[PDB]
Design a protein around this ligand. Structure first.
Ligand SMILES: OC[C@H]1O[C@H](O[C@H]2[C@H](O)[C@@H](O)[C@@H](O[C@H]3[C@H](O)[C@@H](O)[C@@H](O[C@H]4[C@H](O)[C@@H](O)[C@@H](O)O[C@@H]4CO)O[C@@H]3CO)O[C@@H]2CO)[C@H](O)[C@@H](O)[C@@H]1O
Lengths: 370, 422, 38
């Protein structure tokens, strides 16, 4: 089904896909190979559905957590770069895309959530989650709110849930123990209880999603948001004077974001594997290719050493990496999506009142391991 | 212009599910016409059309300029031999049509046959040929104890039957047991298929009653339940009829086209009886000469016959096609196939071709054609359904379809759920 | 782990569970209310 002599790329809608299309245009001018960049919704779920029948893109971009599941189903071509190319990227980024001893994708950039704040509404942002209720009361009296962030995606709420003890899979005896899940322990319950208490006390709304939080922060209605590097371009074009800083602590402990490595996998059903490798290694993973993408939507701390060094002085990237150091790089194992699906429902059910915090997390604990 | 089914076209289909449905209700056996006398099939085979797709297609053809005659549905029914002598069914703009003049002459030596319903539009656009289930050719029932001569001639508990009464010197010849508006009637135009359930002799009167298996014998306590409405009669005792009298001593199995009476259990000789289109209780008079015999009314003599149903569903996923939608693939069973490197799902049925793909909801599966009775497929990625766990109230029953290369979608009656391991 | 249950006109006909550690997955038929003595 995939057309030979062309490249089809899938990348998420929040990433610099227009910048990636510019790299695709340069590739086409030099090789005669047309590159089509698409950003379909639920691409990470569609990829295993269509790639199993020989369809799908030649190249798929997503954070590395999804890739072990794709590799287990035989959907990815093995990545075998020459030593001289492999050395151009940070070893820990190659570790994120290593599964059962094999490289299964090319690492692109390191992402972590940070606290983003409006310097005019809030020159001194809170160091703790505990002081957000009093801050919101003060801002509400002036028709503003303290904080708005995406409550629909567990990626955004996980840093708080993990802070006091929540974890996905315990690492033991050289591997992740898929039967040892940490979503219903005391720490995870304390984190989710605090979040639900914010909703109960009307400091946050259970319905707040990505677009609602982005519009509110970028219009100057909320003093703070929680977001990744990709969100900085839209704030730059707004009138907001913003800062990017360390996430608030909870019970005196840092918020622990799950760190993602944006990665590019090659479809095992692609008849254009050598063209995909040439595009990724010779065009994208260069100072020029990453700059074109980064200028569209910031990538975070890129995997390419030379270009990461060039951008390293950006204080927004230093804050991203300060938050990243306090968290951990996601596992890439197949059970990762099972963990995310279960935690997503637990947060939504507890935030809406459909389940108590305890019942939501106990049920997520069971389902993540099931 | 033959077009493959797209995910968007499947998603659109899964929203409304307006499948074109054809139902053929008929008896499992047919008595032969010896000499010149024609014994028309009784109850008359009935053809039902369901779904909004029939009227929609008609209105589309009128707006396309086909005209009334061109847009009309044409339906013919035959016995399959001689193939040439099919009878027209007046099915246009109707929910159903009964075929009242079908027969099988003594010259036809087939032991079994199927009814064939040929359908097309007035403009010549072919729909196809839809078969009934296999019908056995039988001789007139005799006055002998059915010592399991054929499991086919007997009537099992949990199977469907039609019940009819032949009227002598009346303008209405035959009346059939039928349910409408929560009432049982003796209809002259319609017939119901009733599930006959065997009950234990000590089973009391109730709606949520017991489960019992085996062949129905005379003297057995039975429950007759409408296969469409679920309406039931009170407990009955199926009894053998000789001349115009019910035989209490009969214990022999109930056979095809036997004349039988239904005694209303725990009443004073009350029998299920017709009076015009009405269903009543009629009191039998005990025989002065014979002790184990009760004189019943003509309206209390019912002829019993096993029935069957053939159902076909299709949907033009990519619009009208140049080829007939038949033979409609049928899936009877599923099993996991171990023989081979990867454990594949095995679909057993009929009318499979190398032009069919298995779809799990809106996800197309890798399908391997083995023979006309077997298809194999690789279960596709379905882990996205974990997104619904503790979100949906009940697990979603996801439909499994067979899709043809020209976009025809065939509903299979198969669904799956994806739930946490207990 | 997740389990697949198949239904024919609403009636339960088959259950599949995922294949163990060795080596890939994979589906196995399962009879949860049947004990087979070794
Ligand atoms: O119906 C349930 C929802 O199912 C789908 O969402 C799932 C994804 O399929 C899972 O992969 C997972 O998503 C993770 C994601 O894998 C992980 O990388 C991280 O995603 C970040 C991303 O790294 C970052 O670069 C940026 O894009 O923000 C993303 C988060 O929004 O965290 C995700 C989980 O929050 O779990 C989700 C469900 O939570 C489907 O796409 C949804 O539409 C559907 O509602």
């Amino acid at each position: 089904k995939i057309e030979e002599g062309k490249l089809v790329i899938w990348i998420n809608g929040d990433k610099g896909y227009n910048g990636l299309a510019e790299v695709g245009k340069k590739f086409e001018k030099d090789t005669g190979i047309k590159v089509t960049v698409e950003h379909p919704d639920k691409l990470e779920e569609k990829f295993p559905q269509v790639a199993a029948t020989g369809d799908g893109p030649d190249i798929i971009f997503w954070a590395h957590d999804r890739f072990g599941g794709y590799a287990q189903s035989g959907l990815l071509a093995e990545i075998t770069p020459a030593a001289a190319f492999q050395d151009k990227l940070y070893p820990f980024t190659w570790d994120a895309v290593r599964y059962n001893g094999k490289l299964i994708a090319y690492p692109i950039a390191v992402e972590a959530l940070s606290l983003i704040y409006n310097k005019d509404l809030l020159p001194n942002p809170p160091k703790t989650w505990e002081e957000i209720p009093a801050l919101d009361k003060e801002l509400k009296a002036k028709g503003k709110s303290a904080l708005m962030f995406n409550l629909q995606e567990p990626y955004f709420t996980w840093p708080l849930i993990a802070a006091d003890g929540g974890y996905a899979f315990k690492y033991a005896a050289g591997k992740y123990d898929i039967k040892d899940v940490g979503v219903d322990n005391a720490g995870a319950k304390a984190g989710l209880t605090f979040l639900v208490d914010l909703i109960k006390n009307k400091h946050m709304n259970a319905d707040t999603d990505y677009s609602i939080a982005e519009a509110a922060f970028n219009k100057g209605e909320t003093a703070m948001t929680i977001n990744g590097p990709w969100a900085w371009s839209n704030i730059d074009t707004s009138a907001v004077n913003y800062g990017v800083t360390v996430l608030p602590t909870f019970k005196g402990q840092p918020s622990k974001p799950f760190v993602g490595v944006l990665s590019a996998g090659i479809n095992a059903a692609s008849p254009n594997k050598e063209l995909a490798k040439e595009f990724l290694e010779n065009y994208l993973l260069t100072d020029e290719g990453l700059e074109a993408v980064n200028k569209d939507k910031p990538l975070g701390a890129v995997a390419l050493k030379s270009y990461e060094e060039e951008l390293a002085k950006d204080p927004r990237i230093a804050a991203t990496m300060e938050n990243a150091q306090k968290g951990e790089i996601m596992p890439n194992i197949p059970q990762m999506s099972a963990f995310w699906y279960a935690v997503r429902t637990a947060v939504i059910n507890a935030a809406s009142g459909r389940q108590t915090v305890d019942e939501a997390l106990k049920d997520a604990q069971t389902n993540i391991t099931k | 212009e033959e077009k493959k089914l797209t995910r968007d076209a499947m998603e659109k289909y899964m929203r409304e599910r307006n499948d074109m449905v054809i139902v053929i209700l008929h008896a499992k056996v047919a008595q032969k016409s010896y000499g010149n006398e024609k014994r028309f099939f009784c109850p008359p085979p009935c053809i039902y059309l369901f779904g909004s797709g029939w009227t929609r297609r008609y209105e589309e053809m009128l707006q396309q300029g086909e005209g009334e005659q061109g847009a009309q549905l044409c339906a013919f029914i035959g016995i399959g031999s001689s193939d040439q002598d099919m009878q027209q069914l007046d099915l246009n703009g109707k929910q159903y049509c009964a075929a009242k003049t079908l027969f099988i002459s003594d010259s036809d030596k087939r032991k079994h046959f199927m009814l064939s319903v040929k359908m097309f539009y007035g403009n010549g656009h072919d729909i196809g040929v839809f078969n009934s289930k296999r019908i056995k050719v039988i001789s007139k029932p005799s006055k002998k104890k059915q010592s399991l001569k054929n499991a086919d001639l007997c009537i099992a508990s949990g199977t469907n039957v039609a019940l009819f009464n032949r009227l002598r010197s009346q303008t209405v010849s035959t009346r059939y047991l039928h349910v409408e508006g929560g009432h049982f009637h003796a209809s002259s135009t319609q017939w119901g298929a009733f599930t006959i359930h065997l009950l234990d002799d000590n089973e009391s009167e109730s709606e949520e009653f017991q489960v019992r298996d085996g062949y129905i014998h005379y003297g057995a306590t039975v429950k007759l339940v409408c296969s469409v409405t679920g309406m039931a009669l009170p407990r009955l005792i199926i009894r053998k009829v000789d001349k115009q009298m019910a035989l209490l001593e009969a214990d022999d199995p109930v056979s095809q086209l036997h004349k039988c009476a239904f005694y209303m259990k725990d009443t004073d000789r009350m029998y299920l009886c017709l009076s015009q289109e009405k269903i009543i209780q009629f009191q039998a008079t005990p025989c002065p000469k014979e002790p184990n015999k009760e004189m019943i009314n003509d309206g209390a003599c019912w002829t019993i016959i096993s029935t069957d149903k053939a159902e076909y569903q299709f949907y033009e996923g990519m619009g009208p096609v140049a080829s007939p939608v038949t033979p409609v693939p049928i899936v009877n069973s599923l099993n996991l196939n171990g023989g081979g490197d990867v454990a594949m799902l095995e679909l057993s049925g009929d009318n499979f071709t190398p032009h069919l793909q298995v779809w799990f909801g809106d996800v197309e599966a890798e399908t391997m054609y083995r023979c006309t009775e077997t298809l194999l497929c690789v279960v596709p990625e379905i882990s996205q359904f974990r997104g619904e766990w503790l979100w949906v109230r009940q697990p979603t029953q996801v439909p499994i379809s067979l899709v043809r290369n020209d976009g025809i979608i065939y509903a299979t009656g198969l669904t799956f759920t994806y739930t946490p391991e207990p | 782990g997740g389990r697949l249950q198949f239904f024919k006109d609403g009636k339960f006909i088959l259950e599949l569970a995922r294949s163990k550690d060795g080596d890939k997955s994979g589906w196995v038929s399962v009879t949860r209310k049947t004990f087979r003595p070794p």
